Amino acid sequence: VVDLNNELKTRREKLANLREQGIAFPNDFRRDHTSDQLHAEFDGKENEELEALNIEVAVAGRMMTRRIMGKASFVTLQDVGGRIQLYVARDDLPEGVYNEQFKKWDLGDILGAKGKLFKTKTGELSIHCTELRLLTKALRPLPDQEARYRQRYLDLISNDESRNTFKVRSQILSGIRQFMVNRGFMEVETPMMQVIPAARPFITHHNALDLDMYLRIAPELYLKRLVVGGFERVFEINRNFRNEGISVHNPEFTMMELYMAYADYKDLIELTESLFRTLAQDILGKTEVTYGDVTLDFGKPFEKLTMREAIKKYRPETDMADLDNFDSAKAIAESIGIHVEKSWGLGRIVTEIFEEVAEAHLIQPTFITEYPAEVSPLARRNDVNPEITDRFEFFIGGREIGNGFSELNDAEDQAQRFLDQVYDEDYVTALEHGLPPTAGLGIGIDRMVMLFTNSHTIRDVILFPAMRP
Amino acid sequence: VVDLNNELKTRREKLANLREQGIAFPNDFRRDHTSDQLHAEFDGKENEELEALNIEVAVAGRMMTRRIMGKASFVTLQDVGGRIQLYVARDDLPEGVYNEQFKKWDLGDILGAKGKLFKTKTGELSIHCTELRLLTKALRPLPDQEARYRQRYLDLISNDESRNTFKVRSQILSGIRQFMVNRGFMEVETPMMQVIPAARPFITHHNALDLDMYLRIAPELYLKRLVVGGFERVFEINRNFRNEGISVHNPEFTMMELYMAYADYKDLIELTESLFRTLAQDILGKTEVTYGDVTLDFGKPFEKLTMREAIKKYRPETDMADLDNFDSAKAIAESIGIHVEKSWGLGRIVTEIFEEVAEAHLIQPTFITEYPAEVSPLARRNDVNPEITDRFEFFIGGREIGNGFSELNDAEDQAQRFLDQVYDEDYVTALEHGLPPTAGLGIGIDRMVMLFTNSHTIRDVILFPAMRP
Numbered sequence: 001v002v003d004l005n006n007e008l009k010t011r012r013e014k015l016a017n018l019r020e021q022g023i024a025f026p027n028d029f030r031r032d033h034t035s036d037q038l039h040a041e042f043d044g045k046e047n048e049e050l051e052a053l054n055i056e057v058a059v060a061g062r063m064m065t066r067r068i069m070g071k072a073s074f075v076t077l078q079d080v081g082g083r084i085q086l087y088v089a090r091d092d093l094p095e096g097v098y099n100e101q102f103k104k105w106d107l108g109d110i111l112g113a114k115g116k117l118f119k120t121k122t123g124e125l126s127i128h129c130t131e132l133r134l135l136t137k138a139l140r141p142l143p144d145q146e147a148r149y150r151q152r153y154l155d156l157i158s159n160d161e162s163r164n165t166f167k168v169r170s171q172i173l174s175g176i177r178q179f180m181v182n183r184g185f186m187e188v189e190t191p192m193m194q195v196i197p198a199a200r201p202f203i204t205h206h207n208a209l210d211l212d213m214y215l216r217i218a219p220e221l222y223l224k225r226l227v228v229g230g231f232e233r234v235f236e237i238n239r240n241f242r243n244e245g246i247s248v249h250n251p252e253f254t255m256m257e258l259y260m261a262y263a264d265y266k267d268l269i270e271l272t273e274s275l276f277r278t279l280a281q282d283i284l285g286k287t288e289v290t291y292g293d294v295t296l297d298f299g300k301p302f303e304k305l306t307m308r309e310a311i312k313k314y315r316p317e318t319d320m321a322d323l324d325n326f327d328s329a330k331a332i333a334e335s336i337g338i339h340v341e342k343s344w345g346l347g348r349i350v351t352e353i354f355e356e357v358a359e360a361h362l363i364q365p366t367f368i369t370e371y372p373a374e375v376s377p378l379a380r381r382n383d384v385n386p387e388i389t390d391r392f393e394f395f396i397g398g399r400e401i402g403n404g405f406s407e408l409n410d411a412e413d414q415a416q417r418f419l420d421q422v423y424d425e426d427y428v429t430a431l432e433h434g435l436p437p438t439a440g441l442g443i444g445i446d447r448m449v450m451l452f453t454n455s456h457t458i459r460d461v462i463l464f465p466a467m468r469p
Numbered sequence: 470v471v472d473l474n475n476e477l478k479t480r481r482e483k484l485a486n487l488r489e490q491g492i493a494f495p496n497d498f499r500r501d502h503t504s505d506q507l508h509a510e511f512d513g514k515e516n517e518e519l520e521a522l523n524i525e526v527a528v529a530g531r532m533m534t535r536r537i538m539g540k541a542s543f544v545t546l547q548d549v550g551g552r553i554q555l556y557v558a559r560d561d562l563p564e565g566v567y568n569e570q571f572k573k574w575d576l577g578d579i580l581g582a583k584g585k586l587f588k589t590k591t592g593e594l595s596i597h598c599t600e601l602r603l604l605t606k607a608l609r610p611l612p613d614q615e616a617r618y619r620q621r622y623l624d625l626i627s628n629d630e631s632r633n634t635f636k637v638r639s640q641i642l643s644g645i646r647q648f649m650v651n652r653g654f655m656e657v658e659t660p661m662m663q664v665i666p667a668a669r670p671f672i673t674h675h676n677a678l679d680l681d682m683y684l685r686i687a688p689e690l691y692l693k694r695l696v697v698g699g700f701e702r703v704f705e706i707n708r709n710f711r712n713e714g715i716s717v718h719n720p721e722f723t724m725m726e727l728y729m730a731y732a733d734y735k736d737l738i739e740l741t742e743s744l745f746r747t748l749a750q751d752i753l754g755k756t757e758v759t760y761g762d763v764t765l766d767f768g769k770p771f772e773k774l775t776m777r778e779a780i781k782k783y784r785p786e787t788d789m790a791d792l793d794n795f796d797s798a799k800a801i802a803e804s805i806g807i808h809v810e811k812s813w814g815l816g817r818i819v820t821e822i823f824e825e826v827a828e829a830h831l832i833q834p835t836f837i838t839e840y841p842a843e844v845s846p847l848a849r850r851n852d853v854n855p856e857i858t859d860r861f862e863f864f865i866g867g868r869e870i871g872n873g874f875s876e877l878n879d880a881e882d883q884a885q886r887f888l889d890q891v892y893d894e895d896y897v898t899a900l901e902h903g904l905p906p907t908a909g910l911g912i913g914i915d916r917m918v919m920l921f922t923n924s925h926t927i928r929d930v931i932l933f934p935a936m937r938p
Contacts, residue, residue, distance in 0.1 A: 108903060264497075384650055463657060
């Protein structure tokens with residue numbers, strides 16, 4: 001509506017005026033109370049004690065609602081911790097400000113107010129203002145559902161949903177850090193640019209060294225070098241980059257890899273559990289957490305299932321014996337509607353079948369273990385049965401939330417596998433110097449946040465998701 | 470020496486053997502004590518109580534020193550928390566392991582040992598081993614001063630200096646986080662890739678959006694959008710990228726920008742103080758900290774000086790009146806050996822003079838304030854005297870450690886300045902929606918770490934500095 005176009009005319013003019021009058025953008029006002037502080041400490045006292053205590057306060061915020069009742073007014077201010085009602089009254093206020101100023105201010109303006117606190121007829125706490133003034137002139141007025149992403153600030157002003165999501169995103173991160181730190185872990189910062197990296201790479205170039213670098217897709221190898229070097233309990237929460245498309249998938253998401261010496265994946269499985277269950281318990285309180293059509297329960301121990309067990313559980317009609325023989329597995333793959341490429345060996349047919357049949361039903365928090373060697377990266381072969389490897393994938397809401405291994409510290413085998421998929425020479429060399437047996441944890445922070453704040457898209461948890469120009 | 474080349478022959482063979490015998494890389498051994506734990510809880514008990522308490526322990530680590538006294542041996546193991554002595558004795562140990570195994574292991578091998586703890590003749594705590602075994606075979610032997618950077622793991626194994634530096638680097642970071650969090654701050658994660666950025670840019674390309682992105686040199690603008698949006702106290706400790714050369718200057722260093730609404734640079738100056746003084750106090754204990762030829766004192770309040778004051782203090786012969794007039798300042802610049810380029814106006818000549826004359830002598834922790842408008846970025850002009858701006862630079866050891874402003878929240882002025890140095894349209898738009906008066910803090914984490922661990926080069930504080938290929 002062209003309504004807003006006049007708003008730009010008026011407000012822009014009002015400011016050219018403020019420049020004539022004084023400092024247009026004063027930075028000298030200092031508050032001392034935020035809505036929530038006031039609420040949590042005064043919300044339960046009737047007028048009486050307020051009248052006695054005579055507690056005067058100072059607040060600052062943005063002007064959301066203004067009800068001009070002639071010579072008295074009710075304005076509601078919004079700061080970082082919520083909303084507080086202000087009683088603006090011409091005679092209690094300095095002379096000439098209520099009419100020649102307050103009334104010429106707009107909604108959206110950043111104001112400061114000092115006065116005695118009380119409560120009105122309808123029951124809301126308010127501040128009888130003996131002082132009130134404009135701090136910043138809002139040149140523009142207050143605010144598909146993608147604009148909510150293009151100008152997150154506008155979003156954070158409007159939606160309490162978002163401001164709560166993000167406020168909690170932080171609460172979670174610092175939560176993870178301290179939980180790990182309690183268990184003798186040390187966070188570390190490794191390179192973001194490597195010279196050697198299954199995903200696409202953000203390739204860049206260094207000027208003063210004419211050498212093409214890569215944005216990390218994971219800090220796995222650098223972290224293990226630290227274990228070799230002796231830091232036996234380290235982790236790193238930070239950005240990883242995957243050069244693909246933005247699936248409302250984000251080009252740069254936050255991951256947490258952590259490593260622990262003298263332990264195996266099972267020990268991480270148990271750590272992962274206690275992590276999710278302590279964060280939900282301290283940050284959200286309820287052990288069951290509503291998430292869309294479903295309710296997630298971190299109260300009861302997570303489900304533990306091998307990939308073999310999973311397939312049988314969700315495709316009950318599978319005569320398992322068929323999976324132990326290539327041809328019967330090929331036919332079990334096809335009859336479920338699976339395009340069996342020529343290269344695929346028993347291990348991939350089966351894992352693929354798991355993906356089709358049971359991955360999506362893993363709604364409750366669940367660990368799937370024993371993945372075939374084939375479909376495995378630098379996966380540590382199981383001693384008793386080398387057909388499978390010592391790794392687990394963590395699942396919540398049908399999504400991959402976690403990862404975990406018993407790290408392959410067998411240099412010669414590692415090396416063979418690098419050449420296998422074609423190679424960090426220095427890594428192998430590091431292994432050759434000796435990496436203690438170690439377990440590695442992998443966690444997608446973003447998805448964990450979604451499953452804790454109820455968000456149902458990654459964009460709802462990244463303050464500035466990449467937008468298509 | 471070709472000595473090491475045989476080591477590769479022997480050790481590599483020994484392993485081909487271990488494969489014949491069993492699991493070459495067992496991941497089933499579990500310890501339960503680390504050197505330091507043992508030390509800090511047993512270092513002060515004479516043999517007697519050990520003999521009574523009969524405390525049995527389990528440790529794992531790397532084999533540093535082995536003294537083979539025929540049928541008894543003294544091995545010193547190195548884990549994450551230090552060194553513990555082990556008493557390996559053939560008869561107390563299982564049959565056939567002391568001779569057919571222990572003696573065939575090399576230094577550098579990762580071992581596990583279980584036994585009762587005691588103390589020897591020379592006074593060191595030790596573990597009489599009833600169990601001992603090889604966990605990982607060190608295929609390669611134990612370790613200019615740049616190799617210390619090329620294979621940091623080797624470095625961390627050898628130098629206790631480094632292992633202490635880094636252990637503390639962490640201690641500092643988490644220290645900063647909690648200090649800020651105590652003062653109602655919320656950490657946040659903003660983009661690493663922007664479409665628009667005085668330094669050189671790491672330019673990359675996105676595939677699925679044929680648009681060239683830039684690695685951030687600072688998250689300033691994204692952080693302020695959050696203040697506009699209402700997060701009035703936020704900060705972000707993370708990587709920034711400057712595409713220049715690696716001056717033993719690192720292509721990717723860690724920075725901390727934080728913003729606080731309803732406050733000015735002076736409030737940050739005081740925050741910066743309490744930050745450095747509380748971290749040094751809790752993390753290092755001593756309020757004075759030795760650093761090279763000099764002793765840094767965080768005990769006595771930092772020095773506060775304007776750029777004007779600084780110049781007079783270190784170039785006492787400057788008749789200040791000369792700086793208030795271009796020509797006398799041009800001549801004062803030249804006679805100090807300064808190449809006055811044709812574009813330079815009074816403001817830059819002077820600031821430049823400060824750089825030459827007094828920056829390097831700022832050894833004790835010092836704040837320099839009131840920088841000319843000219844040499845200033847999007848700097849908020851001072852109301853009383855607009856010739857200067859409301860910003861400060863923090864200095865320690867002659868280095869720029871900090872930064873601080875009273876943020877320019879004047880959209881029209883901001884915009885003028887973007888076009889001035891040529892421009893984020895959306896930023897200005899954000900400002901137009903209203904940014905409360907706010908103060909911004911800038912800190913180079915790496916340098917702060919150097920000045921806390923005694924390190925004298927950035928490479929000494931970055932686990933994997935960029936190396937020239």
